Amino acid sequence: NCNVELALTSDGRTIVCYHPSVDIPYEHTKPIPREEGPMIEQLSKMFFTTKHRWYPHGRYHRCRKNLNPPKDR
Amino acid sequence: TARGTPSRFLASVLHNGLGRYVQQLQRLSFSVSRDGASSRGAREFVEREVIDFARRNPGVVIYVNSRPCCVPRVVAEYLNGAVREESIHCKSVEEISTLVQKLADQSGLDVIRIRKPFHTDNPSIQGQWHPFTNKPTTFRGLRPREVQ
Amino acid sequence: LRNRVTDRYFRIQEVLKHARHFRGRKNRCYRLAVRTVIRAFVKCTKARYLKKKNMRTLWINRITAASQEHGLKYPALIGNLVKCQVELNRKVLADLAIYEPKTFKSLAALASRRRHEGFAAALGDGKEPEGIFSRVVQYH
Amino acid sequence: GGQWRLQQGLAANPSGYGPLTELPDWSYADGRPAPPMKGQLRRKAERETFARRVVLLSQEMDAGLQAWQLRQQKLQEEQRKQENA
Amino acid sequence: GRIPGRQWIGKHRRPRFVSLRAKQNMIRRLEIEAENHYWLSMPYMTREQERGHAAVRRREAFEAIKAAATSKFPPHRFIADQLDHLNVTKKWS
Amino acid sequence: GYVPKTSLSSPPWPEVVLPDPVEETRHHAEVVKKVNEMIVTGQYGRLFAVVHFASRQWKVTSEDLILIGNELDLACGERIRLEKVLLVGADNFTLLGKPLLGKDLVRVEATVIEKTESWPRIIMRFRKRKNFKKKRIVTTPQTVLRINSIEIAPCL
Amino acid sequence: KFTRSRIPEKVFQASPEDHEKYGGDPQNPHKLHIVTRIKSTRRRPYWEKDIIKMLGLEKAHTPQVHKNIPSVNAKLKVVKHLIRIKPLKLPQGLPAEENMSNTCLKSTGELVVQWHLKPV
Amino acid sequence: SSFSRAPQQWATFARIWYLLDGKMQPPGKLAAMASIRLQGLHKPVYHALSDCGDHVVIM
């Protein structure tokens, strides 16, 4: 994707760039259409992750996790 | 260290600079001792400087007690309810004066680690990046290897 | 015993409050706590330098990503934004890449155009006019 | 990129001398200039000392050359006055 | 392969080879130092012209050093310090 | 002079011609004029600005906060015109200087929120078997600024 | 053994080709040197360390003014591989007392006596 | 821009599927393109903790 308009100013001290947004054309669009081991295996295959992420952790790790973390924005 | 200490994101108290700056310190509670030696600088501060400090910023209300509960100490109370209890034990007059001026100039938020040196509510004005910002569209929007 | 330490509890607890989040007897026993806490404080002191280094490599990776998706490379964009006297650092360039992509598109186009002006000037040696965006603003 | 900056006469480091580091960072809303930053005060002192040393060394070597010319000229005068009587 | 004693000491030492940036770095140091040879190749005065032109400044610089070294004497002592130590039990009346 | 169509004959990079500066400076003049109309007619929303304050560049917008690691020598609540703006952009256009924008063109104005110090930071030195252990506690002063306004003038 | 090095006079004789290469002329030599340390005095002998400490070149990458006399040239010839030497060119004269606070040193060597920051 | 918080985050951090032709190519250059895409190093949002990798289908 490349379409912007650059222009050095008259005295040549600032660079003015102009860049409107490219809107998606209507013609480029589609219409809207209208156990325990096996559980880890099924979740791993459905989310494309390893099995190791799905086994639980002990109580020591469950307690250090911050329960009201600082939230920004 | 920082992995043992808590942390917070940088913020103001109540949007303190948009419309008007409001003095975020609410009270100061000096508790000097009359016949004392650790409160020598405290008595110097009370005799010399607390009048000028109380006139310099009238948004704070300053209580001075004699024969304290514990030692010469200052108890700064802020608008968000936070209470900072500093001790002026065995401090001279100028150290007490600059500590009080420090207490007047800060907000009640904790002095724990601040995660970012900046905090923007609306960080993107042209629209935050998603993987389709710079990909071009296709004839009727067909993904690769589609027959029709 | 004429005078002996009545105060040692607060010495131990002065060190120990920094070891509470450790694992095993490092968080209780004071020999192990002093060893590991001194180790952790030295690690913090060196990790400031490593923090600045790692932040810079992160900005370099983000600028490289968002310059590859315009066809450029990282050294082209950095070396040609210098030659326009655009003295933006890496932090700002990476954050413009992340949040504000039309400005990074404009910067990539400026870097590419200054690159092409540099190519035309360097290949065409001799008395030739210099390019427009390759103009240098002098400071005295 | 700071090897190209030397070929333009600019500083190698953009944080060196230039408009980024030798203008005031801030000014009041009224328009009053700020009390100057202490980096510029230190840097002006270093620049002053450099110029003072340039002036002093130039004056010293100029006076040394002039003194040598008077030594040679007085030497030849005393020799010519020993070429008499 | 095994190098017997230690990599960079001894009889059989570890092989090191010179890359291209190593050569180019040595080259640019060589160019800087050759330009230094140039700027040292043209003195402005000779030895008999320079003789004694900075004698006065060098002598007064040593006289400043000498008068700093030979003024090393104990500080004064005042009454007001001792009585300002009396002030440590000031009370309110 | 002539080399036939061969794999190493033509460059792999695509040939590009730069336009000669006559119609290019005409194009530049019309673009600068039209951006100047967008500025004077209020065709911008809120503005962002890369601003070189104390020793580092900040992506500053309106209504927001900055932490600075030094005394600024100002009591709390006074406003500030941050000079050394060095990029200012909107939803549709940017203006970036060489290396700065002029003081007649961008006004960025900030307020001093608070004057704190940092959290107590640890400086600990330790060389092993040499009995080398030193500890220092530092608290660096900090000021937090509220950027109030980034307005722009139609001088191009 | 490794001993202090004498550099023969014949390398410090400027050729006309070098006069064409660098911006120097044999008659009318430059008045002052700008010497800068670009290389560390560790893993150098004690005499080179001494001469760097005693030409005022403690800090690397700082400009330092010295005379163009054969004694300073002798010291600089001892330490000519740790330093970079350029001539102090003066486009205006040496600064008068009113102009001397508002001076500057460009990286090309010149000491301008009018230091502005506004564009041309 | 002007999205709600959850869809904007979902749009930023979603992973994409890239088809990669593999006829007459060396395995190393295909591996370069594939590993750059898999670590998420082709994204300005990239971080090693964020797990912003994508799917690559080398046929």
Q: What is the rounded distance in angstroms from the CA atom of residue F60 to the CA atom of residue B94?
A: 37
Helices (H), chain D: 4-7, 19-22, 38-81
Q: Which helix (H) or strand (E) holds C61?
A: helix C30-68
CB-based contact (8 Å) between E49 and chain D?
Answer: yes
CB G35 within 8 A of CB G55: yes
Number of Cβ within a 10 Å radius of residue G70: 16
Longest Cα pair distance anywhere in chain F, in angstroms? 78
CB–CB contact F122 C45 (8 Å): yes
Q: What is the rounded distance in angstroms from the CA atom of residue B138 to the CA atom of residue E39?
A: 65
Residue partners of F1: CB distance under 8 A and separation at least 6: none
Measuring CA to CA, which residue among G118, H33, E10 is closest to residue F103? G118
Measured between CA atoms, how close is D6 to chain E, in angstroms?
14
Q: Which helix (H) or strand (E) holds B97?
A: helix B93-104
Q: What is the rounded distance in angstroms from the CA atom of residue F120 to the CA atom of residue F140?
A: 8
Q: What is the rounded distance in angstroms from the CA atom of residue B116 to the CA atom of residue B101?
A: 26
Taking only Cα atoms into account, the Rg of chain F, rounded to an integer number of angstroms, comes to: 25
Please report the DSSP string for chain F in residue order. Answer: ----S-TTTS-SSPP--PPPHHHHHHHHHHHHHHHHHHHHTT---S-EEEEEETTEEEEEETTEEEEESS--S--TT-EEEE--EEEEE-SSEEEEESS---TTTEEEEEEEEEEEEPPPEEEEEEETTTTEEEEEEE--EEEEEEEEEEEE----
Reduced to 3 states, what is the DSSP secondary structure of residue C139? strand
Measured between CA atoms, how close is C37 to chain G, in angstroms?
35
Question: Which residues face G83 on adjacent strands?
Answer: G37
Domain boundaries, chain G: 1-120
CB-based contact (8 Å) between C93 and chain H?
Answer: no
Return phi, psi of residue C125, to 5°: -70, 165
Q: What is the rounded distance in angstroms from the CA atom of residue F45 to the CA atom of residue F90?
A: 7
CB–CB contact G114 C137 (8 Å): no
Q: How many domains does chain C have?
A: 1
Measured between CB atoms, which of F45, F67, F91 is closest to B117?
F67
CB–CB contact A4 C102 (8 Å): yes
Question: Which residues face G37 on adjacent strands?
Answer: G83
B and A touching (3 or more beta-carbon pairs closer than 8 Å): yes
Q: Using CA coordinates, name the residue in chain B closest to A31.
A: B140
CB–CB contact H1 B126 (8 Å): yes
Helices (H), E1-93: 20-40, 47-50, 55-69, 79-86
Distance between first and last Cα of chain E: 90
Measuring CA to CA, which residue among D27, B20, D24 is closest to residue F80? D27
Q: Which residues of chain H have a CB within 8 Å of the CB of C97?
A: 44
Q: What is the side-by-side strand order in the sheet with B73-78?
A: B61-66, B25-32, B73-78, B83-87
DSSP assigned state of B90: T
Measuring CA to CA, which residue among B2, B9, B11, B6 is closest to residue B80? B11
Q: Using CA coordinates, name the residue in chain E closest to B35.
A: E91
D and C touching (3 or more beta-carbon pairs closer than 8 Å): yes
CB A7 within 8 A of CB F32: yes
Number of Cβ within a 10 Å radius of residue E8: 8
Domain with C132, as residue range(s), is 1-140
Q: What is the side-by-side strand order in the sheet with G63-67?
A: G63-67, G32-37, G83-87
Q: Which residues of chain C have a CB within 8 Å of the CB of D1?
A: 78-79, 82-83
Return phi, psi of residue A18, to 5°: -125, 130
Residue partners of H30: CB distance under 8 A and separation at least 6: H20, H22, H58
Q: How many CA atoms lie within 13 A of B50 on its CB side?
A: 21
Q: How many CA atoms lie within 13 A of C64 on its CB side?
A: 12
CB-based contact (8 Å) between H37 and chain C?
Answer: no
CB F147 within 8 A of CB F65: yes
Measuring CA to CA, which residue among E46, H4, F137 is closest to residue B128? H4
Q: What is the rounded distance in angstroms from the CA atom of residue C125 to the CA atom of residue C133?
A: 18
Positive or negative torsion for Cα G55, G61, G66, G69: positive
Residue partners of D82: CB distance under 8 A and separation at least 6: none
CB–CB contact G30 E44 (8 Å): yes
Q: What is the rounded distance in angstroms from the CA atom of residue F105 to the CA atom of residue F83?
A: 11
Q: Note if the bond before A31 is cis, omega within 30 degrees.
A: no
F117: amino acid identity, one letter: E
Number of Cβ within a 10 Å radius of residue F38: 15
Q: F6-15 long-range contacts, Cβ below 8 Å, gap at least 24? A: none
Query: According to the entry, how was the structure determined?
Result: cryo-EM
Chains touching chain G through at least 3 C-beta pairs below 8 angstroms are C, D, E
Q: How many residues does chain C have?
A: 140
Q: Which helix (H) or strand (E) holds B15?
A: none
